[PDB]
Design a protein around this ligand. Structure first.
Ligand SMILES: *[C@@H]1O[C@H](CO)[C@@H](O[C@@H]2O[C@H](CO)[C@@H](O[C@@H]3O[C@H](CO)[C@@H](O)[C@H](O)[C@@H]3O)[C@H](O)[C@H]2NC(C)=O)[C@H](O)[C@H]1NC(C)=O
Ligand SMILES: *[C@@H]1O[C@H](CO)[C@@H](O[C@@H]2O[C@H](CO)[C@@H](O[C@@H]3O[C@H](CO)[C@@H](O)[C@H](O)[C@@H]3O)[C@H](O)[C@H]2NC(C)=O)[C@H](O)[C@H]1NC(C)=O
Ligand SMILES: *[C@@H]1O[C@H](CO)[C@@H](O[C@@H]2O[C@H](CO)[C@@H](O[C@@H]3O[C@H](CO)[C@@H](O)[C@H](O)[C@@H]3O)[C@H](O)[C@H]2NC(C)=O)[C@H](O)[C@H]1NC(C)=O
Ligand SMILES: *[C@@H]1O[C@H](CO)[C@@H](O[C@@H]2O[C@H](CO)[C@@H](O)[C@H](O)[C@H]2NC(C)=O)[C@H](O)[C@H]1NC(C)=O
Ligand SMILES: *[C@@H]1O[C@H](CO)[C@@H](O[C@@H]2O[C@H](CO)[C@@H](O)[C@H](O)[C@H]2NC(C)=O)[C@H](O)[C@H]1NC(C)=O
Ligand SMILES: *[C@@H]1O[C@H](CO)[C@@H](O[C@@H]2O[C@H](CO)[C@@H](O)[C@H](O)[C@H]2NC(C)=O)[C@H](O)[C@H]1NC(C)=O
Ligand SMILES: *[C@@H]1O[C@H](CO)[C@@H](O[C@@H]2O[C@H](CO)[C@@H](O)[C@H](O)[C@H]2NC(C)=O)[C@H](O)[C@H]1NC(C)=O
Ligand SMILES: *[C@@H]1O[C@H](CO)[C@@H](O[C@@H]2O[C@H](CO)[C@@H](O)[C@H](O)[C@H]2NC(C)=O)[C@H](O)[C@H]1NC(C)=O
Ligand SMILES: *[C@@H]1O[C@H](CO)[C@@H](O[C@@H]2O[C@H](CO)[C@@H](O)[C@H](O)[C@H]2NC(C)=O)[C@H](O)[C@H]1NC(C)=O
Ligand SMILES: *[C@@H]1O[C@H](CO)[C@@H](O[C@@H]2O[C@H](CO)[C@@H](O)[C@H](O)[C@H]2NC(C)=O)[C@H](O)[C@H]1NC(C)=O
Ligand SMILES: *[C@@H]1O[C@H](CO)[C@@H](O)[C@H](O)[C@H]1NC(C)=O
Ligand SMILES: *[C@@H]1O[C@H](CO)[C@@H](O)[C@H](O)[C@H]1NC(C)=O
Ligand SMILES: *[C@@H]1O[C@H](CO)[C@@H](O)[C@H](O)[C@H]1NC(C)=O
Ligand SMILES: *[C@@H]1O[C@H](CO)[C@@H](O)[C@H](O)[C@H]1NC(C)=O
Ligand SMILES: *[C@@H]1O[C@H](CO)[C@@H](O)[C@H](O)[C@H]1NC(C)=O
Ligand SMILES: *[C@@H]1O[C@H](CO)[C@@H](O)[C@H](O)[C@H]1NC(C)=O
Ligand SMILES: *[C@@H]1O[C@H](CO)[C@@H](O)[C@H](O)[C@H]1NC(C)=O
Lengths: 488, 488, 486
């Protein structure tokens, strides 16, 4: 009646969330946000990157020019999408070091092809086969030139092509392995051929083998595919006395953001910076557990399927009492505030400055975390369909190492950040209590439960002056000292 | 007129330990625990992983079937242990890309071998040599079939074997390099042979060289070993006109947790999840400095030989004084407590709740740290006995990079955790002081040394009620104010 | 009569912005750069042995191109290859050049030991006008161009045992003649074969006539191969033509040597860390100059600046204490006292709280500013040729590493700066509370970081509070009489 109670408190919610800290595996906070992206729509968005659907064609088949890949001539991409239904339907072939050729073409991002006029005087050009029909006609890989005998002879070819440009030229060429000695001599006269392709820096010599290829699509013969990159100022030199599958010119090599991905996901009309084989994913979260294979501005792949970042204080659900006892579920207009009991009854008011200070700090850490860009393009392969040994062991170990270090960083980051969020929101509460304590000077005592006993009549305007920071302790000091320091 | 003193304090020990924090290179705490495992028993425990001691056999010699390795036929392992004393005692051989074959067989974890009936019409099978005695008889690698001439001729072999199964088949085969032209024609009739082994995806064509092998165990000849993996739906094609060392069938390729390790540690009867070349090591600690080569559920390798995690507070060794001055070596039944001086003498009591609060938080961190799992199986090689250039530079760099990043994580983690342990144990002391301060209301004053002057007569039951949280300050307030506020 | 005692901390007019866990930009009184971002542009010739390749690549110095003769038997910690280097001997190519360059660079020596191979039956020391040594047709000094003798070139079978306890590096080659006429004039056989074997390995190369493009007058060339022979093993050479034989071996060593491509001049100075841009200081833990380095180097990161706070929050400025703002006129300490009393007014630093904060910051600086990180031969990180799988993996490994270190550096600075701000705020509060507890009932907290002291409190009395010897009992009667009026 001669006194009043002023309690300091913080909000609480009925539906709290559990997060991890440095200290505690599970502490309940008022709010949290997920840092691991774990779902995809399942479709590859066709913006903002240039997506090229390979459909029935591998990139290598589009490169060589298998007839059902003719629509890919001179195509370009940011991301070539290779489908598991793709098939070859041209002359049987193999590519030693297939993976490297696929990778370097994928990274170049273009099949831009420039015809060159090689001087093939002495041999016949444009061989074709019923194994490689283009429409109804016997035909061949569009970018390769199948040379064979002319006028019953096949001379030693010595043919050059200088690179007088300022970019690297990619030449694709091949070696034919006939099924029989009869086919060998019918096509090339010599009983054994030889293909040598040279630059000033390199030499690739292949001796064909008769009868070495298994039966594929009607033929027990095949071509082996090789490649040569000619730098500016260098020269392509081709020397052969049989079995040469010649280039018709070069692919222009570019550098940039292009890559390739294996995926059976449909392409859709939508926009997304991050692509995975499962489909595009949002990149607002810093981490993701959808696929270690990605392209674009992507969250970092981690092993965790959920990491919860606290975005609110500890949740401590509900005469009056202050924050030492529990939080206040009825406070919805701020995070911290005041409840009082005085000659006008009880009331409650949020404290706006302490609430914003806590919110500002939390939004700051959110903006540090919700900010990362991490755009990556052509990388290494991360899934393999063949058993290979040493190099594949190293590719897998590098990726496994990377994911374990990022998963550790993610785990530690959330635990540290959450500990710090709990600490800074506790700290805002204590600061408001101490600020109030020092306004009241000798006119109040701390009751030990987050409340002050104010030793003077302290109606609603007077409480308001405390909340407002304008309380004048000298106006009330005589009344309060007289009430506090009696000995009755 | 009399008064009393109540001091709040924390324990101290006479034998502290030094730890690192963010701030301090060496601060003494009451207790700490080692996070780096730095010893091994020196024995490889034979549980829980299936250990296969190679004894005198390398994995490759067991694979090919050198006679003194006959006992390894169809063996399996989680970890094959290769001994430095191993030796070859059969036909001299070399393996181009030995490391990859060793890796992929080790990773497959089995020598399960399935005989197939290749059609060798036209040649003689089962060649043997006195360099490869099996019992008293000239013999040969058990898994290889040495073909040579029949009825004075060696025809062009064209032999196939389809993979109609749903797993990969591993074929091991070889090429014979005779010492002389006489040996060449005596065995194979043709003056130069050729071994071609093909699938739809690949071709390995080897031209044998007469006289190219150095003298080894009585022979200036040798075989070179190659391998071919045939995927389901593919086919093995073997084409040869001499010098073929044929497969007798295939090894079944598996995927799983198997690997291989080089070690001379003895195998013992015991149980340990983590295996290193030095022997098994315990994995209760998160880090280890024993060997970067490990197998199983292992601590992470780091460069440090010791990292001490604080598990107790800072150690700070006629009247009593509180925590401001130093810790209390005589408090042995709790971490925090009370000392008093009153009209009944001097006394001491531990505070159980604040002690548990500190202990529970520390145990929280310990379980977060001491819970590391980290199970790894087949990895990359990390020690090398040959000089190799580019690929080995990359293998070493990847591992060096990994170890430096984990060593950094381990150092930072321990420094942060220790700072936090010191802060949280300091915080519990302060909270207990402030709780006591607010219980006492106007009846005591803080003397500034961690003690309260209690301004009233305050016998043992009264002290107990403060420690117990049942002190009623109104009972004593008139007495205390009268003693506090005199003007004499 | 009363006094006022304010507790406060310093401030500066020229503060610096740093990042914390909470804040992208908070101003502190002082900070230090953790990223090295400049170089002088010269490679210091101490303390590492630098060998300037000048006009010579390492491989040309290894083979022994005549204008590289001065490099015979040289050694290095770091071989510096210059972009102006050129070849001027017989045209050659090296399959897997990069690996040979790497293992020689890492070995750190061109020490060559001549051995007496038995070439009876062929002629030794073939030479060419494309490879002049002085006025004479010559050849690579370390290679032996063998050709026919007495109209024949027999099947050579030549061995050289390694009876030593180190590995021997053998460099050898295969000649590709321009024409069949050249092939048979030199080697009689219309097609040669070079086989080089150990117990562990076999390298068989078939030469090809006419396969090399025209270079410096010749449509001919040699291809270079290498073989390492371990102790107890043997080199075996078998050839019936086109063999470019070794003259002996290079001794392989292990140690800290490497190679670097750079056009930076070599200077007389001392620096532990070398980059292609020049040497850099290694006092900072991070650097943004070049991911290629050699020696005791800061770790490469993507950021071009990371500022580590080395002082408290900067809060620029009767008297008032730290609740209101910092004190720009306090230049002798970080924390201190301002008073108003019967003798006037003054300001004094508190040395103990200042030193306590400074010691903690110097502690974290020592953890940061100490790292050594000495690295020597690593992987290549820039590439002049398009290659596919292995180069993709080399690039990815390095990109992965740099992103992980850049993250560690960003987090370290944000965490440390938060902690520096927290610990310097904490020293301020601790000094206020210490003063509060000295004053007992003789003062009240005015709420602005100051105490009203309710008694006469002259300079010696203020000094006793600063010193921790204030005796509250001496003044308590006077103070209680002034506080508790009605
Ligand atoms: C070397 O041996 C292999 C295995 O015997 C031979 O491959 C076989 O070649 C025949 C035709 O030359 C293939 O027959 C074809 O079968 C298809 C469908 O089965 C049929 O439509 C065709 O009309 C034709 O009859 C057979 O499939 C193929 N087998 C395998 C396993 O590849 C190869 O031709 C031999 N090469 C020689 C002797 O030069
Ligand atoms: C090519 O030349 C090398 C030597 O330049 C020949 O190697 C030598 O071969 C003979 C056998 O013909 C080996 O003789 C053996 O020596 C041991 C003693 O260690 C003895 O116990 C045996 O009874 C036998 O006499 C000799 O050791 C070996 N030398 C080396 C250095 O390996 C090689 O055989 C020649 N190859 C051809 C195809 O001609
Ligand atoms: C295979 O064909 C190539 C392409 O023509 C031949 O290369 C050419 O060879 C001639 C000499 O045989 C070179 O002529 C020289 O040109 C320089 C001009 O820089 C001149 O100064 C010399 O006096 C001489 O005339 C020509 O440069 C060269 N062309 C190229 C593009 O390299 C090659 O010789 C043929 N190989 C065989 C074995 O026939
Ligand atoms: C709980 O926390 C989240 C994260 O801070 C809050 O969500 C943000 O809300 C603002 C305004 O509505 C949006 O502009 C942001 O985009 C949201 N961020 C995220 C990461 O979702 C949410 O408002 C908080 N409060 C609750 C749920 O009561
Ligand atoms: C995204 O795709 C990956 C790869 O196809 C999915 O991972 C496979 O999941 C199945 C069943 O969950 C497992 O049997 C395979 O072992 C997984 N493969 C790999 C390579 O990890 C993943 O589940 C997909 N995620 C989403 C969200 O669609
Ligand atoms: C475990 O074995 C490793 C490898 O043998 C030991 O490391 C070697 O130690 C010797 C002498 O201490 C050195 O000369 C070698 O250079 C070290 N080799 C490598 C690869 O590091 C290691 O000391 C052993 N540890 C334990 C606990 O037994
Ligand atoms: C700002 O902070 C830097 C870092 O502590 C101070 O520079 C140090 O000063 C001492 C004494 O002069 C030197 O011995 C150290 O080598 C310096 N360290 C570095 C990293 O430069 C500098 O003195 C501080 N400035 C002010 C005005 O206090
Ligand atoms: C690198 O090579 C060039 C070309 O051989 C050298 O420059 C020549 O130097 C000689 C003697 O000093 C002169 O007679 C020539 O006229 C120069 N030619 C040219 C084109 O400049 C140069 O000296 C060599 N540099 C080093 C460091 O050895
Ligand atoms: C080095 O090689 C030559 C050539 O093969 C060896 O010369 C033969 O030596 C034997 C006797 O030692 C003679 O009967 C042959 O007539 C020799 N051939 C010729 C043409 O000289 C010579 O022995 C070998 N040298 C060494 C030191 O082993
Ligand atoms: C050190 O040298 C590197 C490499 O030459 C410089 O990096 C190049 O910088 C220019 C402009 O910044 C770019 O166009 C190139 O793409 C950069 N190359 C690479 C490989 O990054 C770097 O700027 C130099 N640093 C210093 C401090 O001199
Ligand atoms: C709690 O419920 C509110 C109101 O429905 C909702 O907006 C909020 O996101 C929920 N918070 C948590 C942490 O579940
Ligand atoms: C792919 O090939 C199959 C079989 O030729 C055909 O039915 C289908 O139309 C093709 N798809 C595309 C996109 O061309
Ligand atoms: C092509 O080469 C032949 C030499 O075989 C030559 O005679 C002919 O003139 C060349 N043609 C052109 C267009 O240069
Ligand atoms: C010291 O710490 C270890 C690790 O937590 C613990 O097991 C041990 O009991 C502690 N010792 C004492 C005396 O408390
Ligand atoms: C100090 O000695 C006791 C012996 O009773 C031991 O139990 C305790 O762990 C030791 N303290 C530390 C920090 O090791
Ligand atoms: C290994 O070989 C030696 C020599 O043949 C033999 O004495 C020993 O018994 C062999 N060890 C095993 C385990 O077979
Ligand atoms: C093996 O092949 C020969 C080659 O003509 C053939 O005659 C023979 O019948 C085949 N043998 C079997 C068992 O099929």
């Amino acid at each position: 009646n001669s006194t009043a109670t002023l309690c300091l408190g913080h909000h609480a919610v009925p539906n709290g969330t559990l997060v991890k800290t440095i200290t505690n595996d599970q502490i309940e906070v008022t709010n949290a946000t997920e840092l691991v992206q774990s779902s995809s729509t399942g479709r590859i968005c066709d913006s903002p990157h240039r997506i090229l659907d390979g459909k029935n064609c591998t990139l290598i088949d589009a490169l060589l020019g298998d007839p059902h890949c003719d629509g890919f001539q001179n195509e370009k991409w940011d991301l070539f999408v290779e489908r598991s239904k793709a098939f070859s339907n041209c002359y049987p072939y193999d590519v030693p070091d297939y993976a490297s050729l696929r990778s370097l073409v994928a990274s170049s991002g273009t099949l831009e092809f420039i015809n060159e006029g090689f001087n093939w005087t002495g041999v016949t050009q444009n061989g074709g086969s019923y194994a490689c029909k283009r429409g109804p006609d016997n035909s061949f890989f569009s970018r390769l030139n199948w040379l064979y005998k002319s006028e019953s002879t096949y001379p030693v070819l010595n043919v050059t092509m200088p690179n007088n440009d300022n970019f690297d030229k990619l030449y694709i060429w091949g070696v034919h392995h006939p099924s029989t000695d009869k086919e060998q001599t019918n096509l090339y006269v010599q009983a054994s051929g030889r293909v040598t392709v040279s630059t000033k820096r390199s030499q690739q010599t292949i001796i064909p083998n008769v009868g070495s290829r298994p039966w594929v699509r009607g033929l027990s013969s095949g071509i082996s595919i090789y490649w040569t990159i000619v730098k500016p100022g260098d020269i392509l030199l081709i020397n052969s006395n049989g079995n040469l599958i010649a280039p018709r010119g070069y692919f222009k090599i570019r550098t940039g953001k292009s890559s390739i991905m294996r995926s059976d996901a449909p392409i859709g009309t939508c926009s997304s910076e991050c692509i995975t084989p499962n489909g595009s994913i949002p990149n607002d979260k810093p981490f993701q557990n959808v696929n270690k294979i990605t392209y674009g501005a992507c969250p970092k792949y981690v092993k965790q399927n959920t990491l919860k970042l606290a975005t609110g204080m500890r949740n401590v659900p509900e005469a009056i009492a202050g924050f030492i006892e529990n939080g206040w579920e009825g406070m919805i207009d701020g995070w911290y505030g005041f409840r009082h009991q005085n000659s006008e009854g009880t009331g409650q008011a949020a404290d706006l400055k302490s609430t914003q200070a806590a919110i500002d700090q939390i939004n700051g850490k959110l903006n540090r975390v919700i900010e990362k860009t991490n755009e990556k393009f052509h990388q290494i392969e991360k899934e393999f369909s063949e058993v290979e040994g040493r190099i594949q062991d190293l590719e897998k170990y590098v990726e496994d190492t990377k994911i374990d270090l990022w998963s550790y960083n993610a785990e530690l980051l959330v635990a540290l950040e959450n500990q710090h969020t709990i600490d800074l929101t506790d700290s805002e509460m204590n600061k408001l209590f101490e600020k109030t304590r020092r306004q009241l000077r000798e006119n109040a005592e701390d009751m030990g439960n987050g409340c002050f006993k104010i030793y003077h009549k302290c109606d609603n305007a007077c409480i308001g002056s405390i909340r407002n920071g304008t309380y004048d302790h000298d106006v009330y000091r005589d009344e309060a000292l007289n009430n506090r320091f009696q000995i009755k």
